[PDB]
Design a protein around this ligand. Structure first.
Ligand SMILES: CC(C)n1ncc2c1C(=O)CC1(CCN(C(=O)c3ccc4n[nH]cc4c3)CC1)C2
Ligand SMILES: CC(C)n1ncc2c1C(=O)CC1(CCN(C(=O)c3ccc4n[nH]cc4c3)CC1)C2
Lengths: 698, 698
C-alpha cells in the first residue's frame, strides 16, 4: 500500500498497523510471564471506534484506511497475565498520511469524543502522536479573484492601499455559493464598483482560529483525563504545537528515538532570529532534550519497543478506574528476608535495595519482587529513583534516594554565541529543585490514573539551602511534594531505611500528618532523625558552658584546677597561673569533649526515640521489612476496600468513624494490630462482610 | 528604667519582651494589632479624606485556648503568652466593608524561645488555621521564627559518664556513654526513669547502664517538633484552597517557617528579613569552606522577590501591614461572599483614553491603569489608582495584579511587550561561576512567565475567589533549545490546569495590536473551561495558526505569487502571453518586494476578529475605547448570573449548569433582551429579593 510506505518514509508505523504491534507486545508479555502458555486469537481483539448516526462512538469492523478524518481510534480487549479474563483500553492516533496528521476541527472533535468515551468507562487512553500541529489554510477561492488598489497603477513599487473584488469577482462567489467567503465594503473608483476586502473568511473549514478552538478543547480534555484515567503517549513521529502540548498534558510519555516533540520548527525559529541558529528539529525536541528534562519518562528504539513499554507500564495499573490494583505474584514470594543491606562505609546503588543485586556468589534479593522494578523518568533529576515495583505480587509506586553524586550537562545555547555547556553536580541525599520536582511529579503520576499505593524510602538530609538552589526556587518544588501528598488517595508508607535519615527540612514534607487518611511512617533500627545533624545540635545546645561543666565532672585535672580557684587567700599571680592552667586544660579537652557531645546528640536521633514520641508507627529491621510490609500493605488494601464499600452505603461519615465501624465487625479475638490475621479474616469473609454492608443499612 | 524622664511610660521597660523584639529588628507581636489599626485608618484617609473614624471602627481580640483546648477571645496584658505562637481576631470597618470584616492574624513570638516551633506552637497554629477555615475568614501569618525547636535531655547532661579507652589519655577515645547506679537512682527519684534506654553491663566489678537511646522527659526536643512541622505544612496547603492566606516575613523565617511562607503562597517580605532553609554558617561548615557571608545572601529579597516566592517587598513592618490590608481590599469578607464592590470617582461610563498603536512602543500598565501625560491623565481600561501589581520582582514578561472595573474587583493578567532582562547571580559555591544577564523577547511565554501566569490564575481563584481578565497578547511559547530544555512545555501545561480549576468568570480579551497564535491560543481557549470562560478580540487584534510570514511561506509560494503577477501586472501578463506561443524573470525581480507585501496582507486579512466571529470562536469583536463600558456590564451581568446559578444549587437536588442558566434566563421578562448585559444585571439586582423569596420553595 502507498499509505503504508508514506508512513514508513516519515519514520513511523501506519496507524492501522499499530493494533498488530499491541498484539505482538501482549503475546511477548505472556511469553515472559509463562513460556508454556498457549495463546489463541481470542486473547487479543482490536475494534475500530467510529461515530454512529447520533455522533456517538461505536465499535466497528471496517476495512482499514477508510478514515475520512486524520484521527483514528481502537478499543482493545486483551487477556494479560494480570487480567487473564481481559482488560480494555482505547488507542487514539493521528494518521500522519491524512493531511500530514494535522489537527483540524474534525480530528479535535473526534479526539475529544474518544477521550470522553475512555473517561466514561474508566479505561486507559493511549495516544500515538504523529502529527504537524493545528491545520493551516487560506481562502483559495479568493486567491484568483482579489484586485490591488495601487497608489499609482503605473508604478506598483509606490505601494497599495487595500485589496478588493470586482462585481464579476462577487458574482463568481455568488454563483459558487461562496458569498460568505469575504467581508466587503462597497466603494466606486473610476466609475467602477470596488468591494474592498475588510476580512477573508473562506468557504473551506480548517484554515485558522477554528483549528485553534479545537486545540484548546483537546488540551482541556487531556488535562481532565489525566486526573481520571491512566493516560500515556507514544511519540511515534514528530509531535508539533498542540501535539507537543498533548504529550505533556497526558503526563506519561514514551519517546521513540529520533522523533521530535516541538513547538516551532528550527527553520521558522531561524527566520525569526534572522540567522542560521538551529540545524534540526531534533536539536529542539529530541530525546537528549525531553528525556533529559523529564517531559519524556522513557525512550524507545522503535515503535514496537514503545508499544512494549506501554503494555509493561499498564501491567501495574488497574483494568479501569477504582478497580483494585492488579496482583501478580511471581516465583519471588513474600516469605523471605531481604538480602542486600546497605552500610554507612560502602557506596551503594539504591536500586540494589529495591530490586536486588546480582553477585559472584549469586543473587542478593532486595525489598521488592525480583525483576519487578520498572524505572521511569530515568533520564531526569537522577538524585531520586522512581518506578513501579511489586511486593509479593502487590503493585506500587516506589521513590528511592540516589546516594551517589549526580551530574547533568546543560547544553550550550545555540542562540547565544557566549554560551558553553555546563556540568552541574548535586550531592546525594539532598533535594534540589529538579529532584524535588521529580518527587512531586512521581507522587502525582502514581496517584492519578495509576491509583497505586506508594512507598517512599525516605533518605534526605534536607533541601539544598545554598544561594543558587534558593534562587532556583527549591521552596516551590518542595511545596509541590506537600500538595501531591495531600491529594493522595491510596495507602502510603514512609520508611526511613537502614543508613537512612530525615532532618528538619526533609521531614516537613513527608510527615504522615500531611495526609493522616493514607500515610504512615516507619524507621529502621539503624535510621536517624532529628531537627539538625549532631554538628548543628551541639552548636545550638551543647555550647562551651556545657562542655566546661562536663570537663569539671569527668576530668580529674580540670576539676582539680577549678577547685584550687575556691581559695580566697591566693596571691594574684598564683591565681593567674592556675586559671591559665584551667584554660590550657580546656583547649586540650575541647576536641574529645566535642566528640562526646556529638555522641550525646546522636543518641537522641534514634528510631527508639521516634517510637517513644509517637511520630512513627513502628521501628523495623530491614531484613524483615519485606515480610512486614507485604502483610501491612495487603491488610491496608483490604481495609481501604471495605471503607469504600461503606462509603457507597449509609451516606456521609468521617474516615475515623468508617474504619472504627469496619474494625468493630472483626471477631473480638482478632488482634487489630496483626496485619496477616486481619487481611486473612477479611479475605475469608468478603461475602459475609458484603451481607453485613447490605444488611446494616436498613 | 532607661530612659529616665520620658513624658509617657517606657513601653520597652514595662514589657522587656518588646525591647527584645526591637533588638531582633522586628515589631513586638502584641504591637502588630496597632499597626493593623494604623493601616486600616490610612485606608479610610486614602478612600475619603473627610471620613471621621471612632475607636469602634477597629477591634483586635487575642485568641487563646480554653480548658477544652477551644479558641476563645480574651483581653489580657501583652507578654502573658505561655507559648511562642499568638493569634488575634480582627474586626475592622473598611471602605469595601463599612459595617465590618473579620480576619485572623497568627504570629510567632520571636521573644519566646527565639520564635521556634515546638509541638504546642504547631498545635495552636493548626487550631487557628482551622478556626479561620471554619468561619471562611482570611488567615494572615506574621513570620518571625527560628524553625523547629531544638533540644536535648537536660536531666542527662549532669549524669552521663564516658567509657574511656584509656582514662589517663582522653584523646585516645571513648567507647560509649553510661549511667552509674546512682545516676539511675537520681532519675528514679525525679520520676524520669523513661528518659533513657539503657543496657546493664559490669566492668571492674561496677554496674554500667550503657546509654542505648536518649529520650528525655521534656517535650520539644526533636522528631515531635518535626511531626508538628508536617501537620502545619499540610494545614497551610489545605487552607490556601479554602480561605485567603497571606504571610508577612517580619523577621527571619527558617525551615518550616520558610515552607509556611511558600505554602500560604501570598507573601510580603520586609527588606533585610531572610527566608532561609539552612543558615550560611552551617552551609559553610558542611562545604568545609567560607562560601557564604550572610543569611540575606541565601534568602533576602534579591533572591525571593526576584524568584516569585515573595510577591511583594516592604521597607518595614507597617509598609508590609499596609500591603496586606490593600491586597485584602479586593478580597471577599469571607469565603463565598460576593467580590467586594468599591466604586471610586472613576466611574464605568467613560471611553478608554490610552490606545496602543502598531508602530509605537507602550507599557501595558498604561492600558490597564492609565498614563499621566503633559496634557493631563489618559485613563486606561480599569479604575484610576486601582491597579495593585503583585509578583512584580519576578518574570516581568507578564504583568499580574488586582484592579477594579467600575468598582468590581478582579485579577488582571497583561503582557509586557518590551524585552525583559533578569540577572542570574554568580553561584558563590562555584569559583567558575559568573553573573548572567538573560533577555527574553516581549509577547513570548518563557518558562518563568508561563509559571507566573499559572501561579496568578491559581492565586486569583483560591481564597481570593476573584473573576479574571487576561489581556491575551502572546505570539506563542519560546520554542528554542534552551527554553525547551528548561521545560517550557511543563509550565505552559500548568496554565491549562489552572484554567480547568477556575471557579469565577473569566474574560480572555485580545486587545488592540494584540495577538494569539497556534501555540498561545491552545492554553487560553474558552473550551478549556466552558463554564467560566469567554473570549473577545479587538477589531485591531490578530489570530491565526502562524504569523503572516509563516502562512505565506507555505500557502503563498513563488508560483502562486507569479500567478498573481500574471493576473495583476500588465507588463508580467504580456511577457507570459508571449512565451505561450530570462526577460519575464526580471519583471519578477522588480515586483517581488511589493507582491510579497500583498501576499502578507492577503494572509493578514484572514487573521481578523471578523473571521473569529464568523467561525464562532469569540463571543464578540470589540472596540478598545468602548471596552470599559462593555466589560463593566458584561462582568456585572455574569457575576449576577453566577450568583443565581449558586442559589439554584440550594434547590431541587442536582441539575446541570446548562439547565440552571436556562431556568434562570427563562425568568427574564419580554422587555429584557438577554443579549443586553446592563438590562439583565439591572433586572436581576431589582428582583434578587423577589427571586430569593420565590425560590424558597419552588
Ligand atoms: C551544601 C548543600 C548542597 N547541602 N549539602 C548537604 C546538606 C545541604 C543543605 O543545604 C542542607 C543540609 C541539611 C542538614 N544539615 C544540618 O542539619 C546541619 C545543620 C547545622 C549544622 N552545623 N554544622 C553542621 C550542620 C549540619 C546540613 C545542611 C544538608
Ligand atoms: C525565538 C523565540 C524566543 N521567539 N521569538 C518570537 C517567537 C518565538 C518563538 O519561539 C515562537 C514564535 C511563535 C509565532 N511565530 C510564528 O507563527 C511564525 C511561524 C513560522 C514563521 N516563518 N517565518 C516567520 C514565522 C513566524 C514565530 C515563532 C514567536
Amino acid at each position: 500500500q502507498p499509505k503504508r510506505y508514506k508512513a514508513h518514509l516519515m519514520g513511523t508505523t501506519y496507524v492501522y498497523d499499530f493494533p498488530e504491534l499491541f498484539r505482538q507486545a501482549s503475546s511477548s508479555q505472556w511469553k515472559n510471564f509463562s513460556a508454556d502458555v498457549k495463546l489463541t486469537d481470542d486473547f487479543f481483539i482490536s475494534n475500530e471506534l467510529i461515530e454512529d448516526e447520533n455522533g456517538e462512538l461505536t465499535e466497528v469492523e471496517r476495512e482499514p484506511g477508510a478514515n475520512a478524518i486524520g484521527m483514528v481510534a481502537f478499543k482493545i480487549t486483551v487477556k494479560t497475565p494480570e487480567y487473564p479474563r481481559g482488560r480494555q483500553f482505547v488507542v487514539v492516533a493521528n494518521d500522519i498520511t491524512f493531511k500530514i496528521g494535522s489537527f483540524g476541527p474534525q480530528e479535535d472533535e473526534f479526539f475529544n469524543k474518544v477521550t470522553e468515551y475512555a473517561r466514561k468507562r474508566g479505561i486507559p487512553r493511549i495516544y500515538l502522536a504523529a502529527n504537524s500541529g493545528a491545520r493551516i489554510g487560506m481562502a483559495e477561492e479568493i486567491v484568483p479573484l482579489f484586485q490591488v488598489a495601487w497608489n499609482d497603477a503605473a508604478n506598483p513599487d509606490k505601494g497599495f492601499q487595500y485589496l478588493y473584488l470586482t462585481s464579476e469577482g462577487m458574482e463568481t462567489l455568488k454563483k459558487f455559493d461562496k458569498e460568505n467567503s469575504v467581508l466587503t465594503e462597497r466603494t466606486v473608483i473610476n466609475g467602477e464598483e470596488r468591494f474592498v476586502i475588510k476580512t477573508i473568511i473562506g468557504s473551506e473549514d480548517g484554515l485558522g482560529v477554528e483549528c485553534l478552538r479545537g486545540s484548546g478543547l483537546i488540551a482541556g480534555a487531556t488535562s481532565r483525563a489525566y486526573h481520571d484515567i491512566f493516560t500515556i503517549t507514544l511519540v511515534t513521529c514528530r509531535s508539533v504545537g498542540i501535539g507537543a502540548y498533548l504529550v505533556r498534558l497526558g503526563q506519561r510519555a514514551i519517546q521513540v528515538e529520533g522523533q521530535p516533540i516541538i513547538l516551532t520548527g528550527a527553520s521558522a525559529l531561524n527566520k525569526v532570529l534572522g540567522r542560521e541558529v538551529y540545524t534540526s528539529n531534533l536539536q529542539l525536541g529530541g530525546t537528549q532534550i525531553m528525556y533529559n528534562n523529564g517531559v519524556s519518562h522513557l525512550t524507545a528504539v522503535d515503535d514496537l519497543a514503545g508499544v512494549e513499554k506501554i503494555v509493561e507500564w499498564m501491567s501495574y495499573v488497574p483494568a479501569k478506574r477504582n478497580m483494585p490494583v492488579p496482583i501478580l505474584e511471581t516465583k519471588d514470594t513474600w516469605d523471605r528476608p531481604v538480602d542486600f543491606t546497605p552500610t554507612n562505609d560502602e557506596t551503594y546503588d539504591v536500586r540494589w535495595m529495591i530490586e536486588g543485586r546480582e553477585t559472584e556468589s549469586g543473587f542478593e534479593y532486595g525489598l521488592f519482587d525480583k525483576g519487578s522494578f520498572f524505572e521511569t523518568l530515568s533520564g531526569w533529576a537522577k538524585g531520586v529513583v522512581v518506578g513501579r515495583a511489586r511486593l509479593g505480587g502487590i503493585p506500587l509506586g516506589v521513590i528511592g534516594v540516589e546516594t551517589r553524586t549526580v551530574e547533568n550537562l546543560i547544553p550550550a545555547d545555540p542562540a547565544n554565541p557566549n554560551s558553553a555547556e555546563t556540568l552541574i553536580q548535586q550531592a546525594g541525599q539532598v533535594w534540589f529543585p529538579n529532584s524535588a520536582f521529580k518527587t512531586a511529579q512521581a507522587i502525582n503520576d502514581f496517584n492519578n490514573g495509576e491509583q497505586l499505593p506508594m512507598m517512599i524510602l525516605a533518605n534526605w538530609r534536607g533541601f539544598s539551602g545554598g544561594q543558587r538552589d534558593m534562587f532556583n526556587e527549591v521552596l516551590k518544588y518542595g511545596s509541590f511534594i506537600v500538595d501531591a501528598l495531600v491529594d493522595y488517595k491510596q495507602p502510603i508508607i514512609i520508611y526511613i531505611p537502614p543508613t537512612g535519615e530525615l532532618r528538619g527540612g526533609s521531614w516537613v514534607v513527608v510527615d504522615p500528618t500531611i495526609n493522616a487518611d493514607q500515610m504512615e511512617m516507619y524507621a529502621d533500627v539503624n535510621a536517624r532523625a532529628g531537627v539538625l545533624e549532631p554538628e548543628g545540635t551541639v552548636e545550638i545546645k551543647f555550647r562551651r558552658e556545657k562542655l566546661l561543666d562536663t570537663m569539671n565532672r569527668l576530668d580529674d585535672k580540670y576539676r582539680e584546677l577549678r577547685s584550687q580557684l575556691s581559695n580566697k587567700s591566693l596571691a594574684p599571680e598564683v591565681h593567674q597561673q592556675i586559671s591559665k592552667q584551667l584554660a590550657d586544660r580546656e583547649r586540650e579537652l575541647l576536641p574529645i569533649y566535642g566528640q562526646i557531645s556529638l555522641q550525646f546528640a546522636d543518641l537522641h536521633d534514634r528510631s527508639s526515640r521516634m517510637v517513644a514520641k509517637g511520630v512513627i508507627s513502628k521501628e523495623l529491621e530491614w531484613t524483615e521489612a519485606r515480610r512486614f510490609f507485604f502483610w501491612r500493605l495487603r491488610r491496608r488494601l483490604n481495609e481501604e476496600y471495605l471503607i469504600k464499600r461503606l462509603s457507597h452505603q449509609v451516606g456521609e461519615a468521617s474516615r475515623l468513624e468508617k474504619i472504627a465501624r469496619i474494625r468493630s465487625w472483626y471477631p473480638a479475638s482478632v488482634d487489630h494490630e496483626d496485619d496477616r490475621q486481619v487481611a486473612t479474616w477479611i479475605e475469608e469473609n468478603y461475602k459475609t462482610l458484603d451481607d453485613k454492608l447490605k444488611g446494616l443499612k436498613l
